[PDB]
Amino acid sequence: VLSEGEWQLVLHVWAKVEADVAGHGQDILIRLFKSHPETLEKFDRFKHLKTEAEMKASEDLKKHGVTVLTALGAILKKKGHHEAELKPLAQSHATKHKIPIKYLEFISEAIIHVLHSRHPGDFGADAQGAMNKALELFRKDIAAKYKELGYQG
Ligand code: HEM
């Protein structure tokens, strides 16, 4: 359970992300695909992209980065009370997209790296720890729905 102070650190940096949702979404997905190429293979939509420059040039990738970060921002702003938001996302990711929980750990690492690069003054160690706690809570609650559905592993 995050404390109020931890949530304030999370949402303070997140309000900065929202100034350029699309640039953040591109940077996070590109870092994910470069750091963990098995993730790119899950996207029929993107798996034709073979270089970082091709990834940066893809408008469709930039659009999907916005989709992803808008869903995550709506979850963070619930401060843990996010059951209604996670149901459909766990269901699609487990049963349609076939995304292991581990790959959610990988995207969490990419989010934290990009927030540290773009917002160092608002993303000191206290805020890095709080965001890590918020993304761990996200993964914990998604993993429980995966397990219900027979996909935790
Ligand atoms: C912060 C974590 C993530 C969030 C908030 C998120 C959010 C979303 C949203 C909102 C959609 C569109 C609606 C839906 O299908 O449920 C989507 C689609 C999708 N996501 Fe995620 N996602 C996350 C992580 C991942 C990861 C790690 C992968 C793969 C490694 C992944 C793979 C996909 C795929 C394959 C689609 C369908 C893309 C298409 O063909 O249109 N997601 N995601």
Coordinates of C-alpha atoms and ligand atoms in Angstrom, one line a residue:
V1 CA 0.0 0.0 0.0
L2 CA 1.5 3.4 -0.9
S3 CA 1.3 6.2 1.6
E4 CA -0.2 9.5 0.7
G5 CA 3.3 11.0 0.5
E6 CA 4.4 8.3 -1.9
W7 CA 1.4 8.9 -4.1
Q8 CA 2.1 12.6 -4.2
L9 CA 5.7 11.9 -5.5
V10 CA 4.3 9.6 -8.2
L11 CA 1.6 12.0 -9.4
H12 CA 4.0 15.0 -9.2
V13 CA 6.3 13.4 -11.8
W14 CA 3.4 12.0 -13.7
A15 CA 1.9 15.6 -14.2
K16 CA 5.2 16.4 -15.9
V17 CA 4.9 13.4 -18.3
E18 CA 1.5 14.6 -19.3
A19 CA 3.2 17.7 -20.8
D20 CA 4.4 15.5 -23.6
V21 CA 2.6 12.2 -23.5
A22 CA 3.5 11.2 -27.0
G23 CA 7.4 11.8 -26.6
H24 CA 7.4 9.8 -23.4
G25 CA 5.4 7.0 -25.0
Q26 CA 7.8 6.7 -27.9
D27 CA 10.9 6.8 -25.7
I28 CA 9.4 4.1 -23.4
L29 CA 8.3 1.7 -26.1
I30 CA 11.6 2.1 -28.0
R31 CA 13.6 1.4 -24.8
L32 CA 11.4 -1.7 -24.1
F33 CA 11.9 -3.0 -27.7
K34 CA 15.7 -2.4 -27.7
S35 CA 16.3 -3.7 -24.1
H36 CA 14.0 -6.8 -24.6
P37 CA 13.5 -7.7 -28.2
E38 CA 11.2 -10.6 -27.3
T39 CA 8.6 -7.8 -26.5
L40 CA 8.6 -6.4 -30.0
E41 CA 7.6 -9.8 -31.3
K42 CA 4.3 -9.6 -29.4
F43 CA 3.3 -6.7 -31.6
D44 CA 2.2 -7.8 -35.1
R45 CA 1.6 -4.0 -35.5
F46 CA 5.3 -3.1 -35.0
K47 CA 7.4 -6.2 -35.6
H48 CA 8.4 -4.8 -39.1
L49 CA 10.5 -2.2 -37.3
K50 CA 14.2 -3.2 -37.4
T51 CA 16.1 0.0 -36.3
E52 CA 15.7 2.6 -33.7
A53 CA 15.4 5.3 -36.4
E54 CA 12.5 3.3 -38.0
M55 CA 10.9 3.1 -34.6
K56 CA 11.3 6.9 -34.0
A57 CA 9.8 7.6 -37.5
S58 CA 6.6 5.4 -36.9
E59 CA 3.6 7.5 -36.3
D60 CA 1.6 4.4 -35.4
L61 CA 4.1 3.6 -32.7
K62 CA 3.8 7.1 -31.3
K63 CA 0.0 6.7 -31.3
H64 CA 0.2 3.5 -29.4
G65 CA 2.6 5.1 -26.8
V66 CA -0.1 7.6 -26.1
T67 CA -2.7 4.8 -25.7
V68 CA -0.5 3.0 -23.2
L69 CA 0.5 6.1 -21.2
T70 CA -3.1 7.4 -21.0
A71 CA -4.3 4.0 -19.6
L72 CA -1.4 4.0 -17.1
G73 CA -2.1 7.6 -16.0
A74 CA -5.8 6.8 -15.4
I75 CA -4.6 3.9 -13.2
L76 CA -2.0 6.0 -11.2
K77 CA -4.6 8.7 -10.5
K78 CA -6.8 6.2 -8.8
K79 CA -4.1 5.7 -6.1
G80 CA -4.6 2.0 -5.8
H81 CA -8.4 2.0 -6.2
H82 CA -8.0 0.8 -9.8
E83 CA -10.0 -2.4 -10.0
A84 CA -12.3 -1.2 -12.8
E85 CA -9.3 -0.1 -14.9
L86 CA -7.4 -3.3 -14.5
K87 CA -10.1 -5.8 -15.4
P88 CA -10.2 -5.1 -19.1
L89 CA -6.4 -4.6 -19.3
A90 CA -5.6 -7.9 -17.5
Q91 CA -8.1 -9.7 -19.6
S92 CA -6.8 -8.4 -22.9
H93 CA -3.2 -8.8 -22.0
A94 CA -3.5 -12.3 -20.6
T95 CA -5.9 -13.8 -23.1
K96 CA -5.6 -11.9 -26.4
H97 CA -2.1 -10.3 -26.4
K98 CA -0.5 -13.1 -24.5
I99 CA 1.9 -10.8 -22.4
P100 CA 3.7 -12.5 -19.6
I101 CA 3.9 -10.6 -16.2
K102 CA 7.6 -10.5 -16.7
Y103 CA 7.2 -8.3 -19.7
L104 CA 5.2 -5.9 -17.5
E105 CA 8.3 -5.8 -15.2
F106 CA 10.3 -4.9 -18.3
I107 CA 8.1 -2.0 -19.3
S108 CA 8.1 -0.8 -15.7
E109 CA 11.9 -0.5 -15.9
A110 CA 11.6 1.4 -19.2
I111 CA 9.1 3.9 -17.7
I112 CA 11.3 4.5 -14.7
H113 CA 14.4 5.1 -16.9
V114 CA 12.6 7.5 -19.2
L115 CA 11.1 9.5 -16.2
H116 CA 14.6 9.7 -14.7
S117 CA 16.1 11.0 -18.0
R118 CA 13.4 13.6 -18.7
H119 CA 12.5 14.8 -15.1
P120 CA 15.6 14.5 -12.9
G121 CA 14.6 17.4 -10.6
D122 CA 11.2 15.7 -9.9
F123 CA 12.5 12.2 -10.0
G124 CA 15.0 11.9 -7.2
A125 CA 15.4 8.7 -5.3
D126 CA 12.4 9.2 -3.1
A127 CA 10.2 9.6 -6.2
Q128 CA 12.0 6.7 -7.9
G129 CA 11.2 4.5 -5.0
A130 CA 7.5 5.6 -4.9
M131 CA 7.1 5.1 -8.6
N132 CA 8.6 1.6 -8.3
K133 CA 6.1 0.9 -5.6
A134 CA 3.2 2.1 -7.7
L135 CA 4.3 0.0 -10.7
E136 CA 4.8 -3.0 -8.4
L137 CA 1.2 -2.6 -7.1
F138 CA 0.1 -2.5 -10.8
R139 CA 1.9 -5.7 -11.5
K140 CA 0.7 -7.4 -8.3
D141 CA -2.9 -6.7 -9.1
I142 CA -2.6 -7.7 -12.7
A143 CA -0.8 -10.9 -11.7
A144 CA -3.7 -11.8 -9.5
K145 CA -6.2 -11.5 -12.4
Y146 CA -3.8 -13.5 -14.6
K147 CA -3.7 -16.2 -12.0
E148 CA -7.6 -16.3 -11.8
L149 CA -7.6 -16.8 -15.6
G150 CA -4.9 -19.4 -15.7
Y151 CA -2.1 -17.4 -17.1
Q152 CA 0.2 -16.5 -14.2
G153 CA 2.5 -19.5 -15.0
Ligands
HEM1 C1 2.2 -0.2 -18.4 C2 1.8 -1.3 -19.0 C3 0.8 -1.4 -20.2 C4 -0.3 -0.7 -20.3 C5 -0.9 0.3 -19.4 C6 -0.8 -1.2 -21.5 C7 -2.0 -0.7 -22.2 C8 -2.5 -1.1 -23.4 C9 -3.8 -0.6 -24.0 C10 -4.6 0.5 -23.3 C11 -4.0 -1.2 -25.1 C12 -5.2 -1.1 -26.1 C13 -6.4 -1.8 -25.4 C14 -6.3 -3.3 -25.0 O1 -6.0 -4.1 -25.9 O2 -6.4 -3.7 -23.8 C15 -2.9 -2.1 -25.3 C16 -2.7 -3.0 -26.4 C17 -1.7 -3.9 -26.6 N1 -0.6 -4.1 -25.7 FE1 -0.4 -3.2 -23.9 N2 0.0 -2.1 -22.1 C18 1.0 -2.4 -21.3 C19 2.1 -3.2 -21.4 C20 2.3 -4.1 -22.5 C21 3.4 -4.9 -22.8 C22 4.6 -5.0 -21.8 C23 3.2 -5.5 -23.9 C24 4.2 -6.4 -24.8 C25 5.4 -6.8 -24.4 C26 1.9 -5.1 -24.5 C27 1.4 -5.5 -25.6 C28 0.2 -5.1 -26.2 C29 -0.3 -5.5 -27.5 C30 0.3 -6.5 -28.4 C31 -1.5 -4.7 -27.7 C32 -2.3 -4.7 -29.0 C33 -1.6 -3.7 -30.0 C34 -2.4 -3.7 -31.3 O3 -2.1 -4.5 -32.2 O4 -3.2 -2.8 -31.5 N3 1.3 -4.2 -23.6 N4 -2.0 -2.0 -24.2

